[PDB]
Amino acid sequence: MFIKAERLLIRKFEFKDWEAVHEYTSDSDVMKYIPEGVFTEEDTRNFVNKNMNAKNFPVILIGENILVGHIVFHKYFGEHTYEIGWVFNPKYFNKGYASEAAQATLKYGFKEMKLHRIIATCQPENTPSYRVMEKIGMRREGYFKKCIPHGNEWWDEYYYAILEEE
Amino acid sequence: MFIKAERLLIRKFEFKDWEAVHEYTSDSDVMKYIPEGVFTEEDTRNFVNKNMGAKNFPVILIGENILVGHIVFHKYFGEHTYEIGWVFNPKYFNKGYASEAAQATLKYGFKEMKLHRIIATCQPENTPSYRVMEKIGMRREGYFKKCIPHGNEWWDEYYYAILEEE
Ligand SMILES: CC(C)(COP(=O)(O)OP(=O)(O)OC[C@H]1O[C@@H](n2cnc3c(N)ncnc32)[C@H](O)[C@@H]1OP(=O)(O)O)[C@@H](O)C(=O)NCCC(=O)NCCS
Q: Which domain holds residue A70?
A: 1-166
Give a three-class secondary structure readout of chain A: CCEECCCEEECCCCHHHHHHHHHHHCCCCCCCCCCCCCCCHHHHHHHHHHCCCCCEEEEEECCCCEEEEEEEEEEEECCCEEEEEEEECHHHHHHCHHHHHHHHHHHHHHHHCCCCEEEEEECCCCHHHHHHHHHCCCEEEEEEEEEEEECCEEEEEEEEEEECCC
Residue list, ligand 1 pocket, CB within 6 Å:
A 2, 11; B 30, 33, 85-88, 93-99, 122, 126-129, 131-132, 135
CATH number at residue B127: 3.40.630.30
Q: Which residues contact B59 (CB under 8 A, 6 or more apart)?
A: B8, B9, B10, B67, B68, B69, B70, B71, B88, B97, B101
Say how many CA atoms lie within 13 Å of B16 toward its Cβ.
Answer: 1
Shortest CA gap B91–chain A (Å): 7
d(CA B57, CA B82): 14
**Contact with chain A for residue B94, Cβ under 8 A:** yes
Tell me how the structure was determined: X-ray
Closest CA to B161 of B84, B92, B91: B84
- A11 to chain B: nearest residue by CA? B127
Check A65 against B127: CB less than 8 A apart: no
DSSP code of residue B96? S
> Rounded to the nearest 5°, which phi and psi values hold at B109?
-55, -45
Q: How many domains does chain A have?
A: 1
In this structure, the dihedral spanned by the alpha carbons of residues A122, A126, A131 and A134, taken in order and rounded to 10 degrees, is 20
Pocket probe for ligand 1: among B86, B97, B123, B126, the residue whose CB has the most ligand atoms within 8 Å is: B86
Q: Is A135 annotated as a binding residue?
A: yes
| Centroid of ligand 1 to alpha carbon of B7 (angstroms) | 17
Q: Is B135 annotated as a binding residue?
A: yes
* Residue B51 DSSP SS3: coil
Q: Using alpha carbons only, give the angle B136, B30, B88 rounded to the nearest 5 degrees.
A: 45
d(CA A67, CA A55): 17
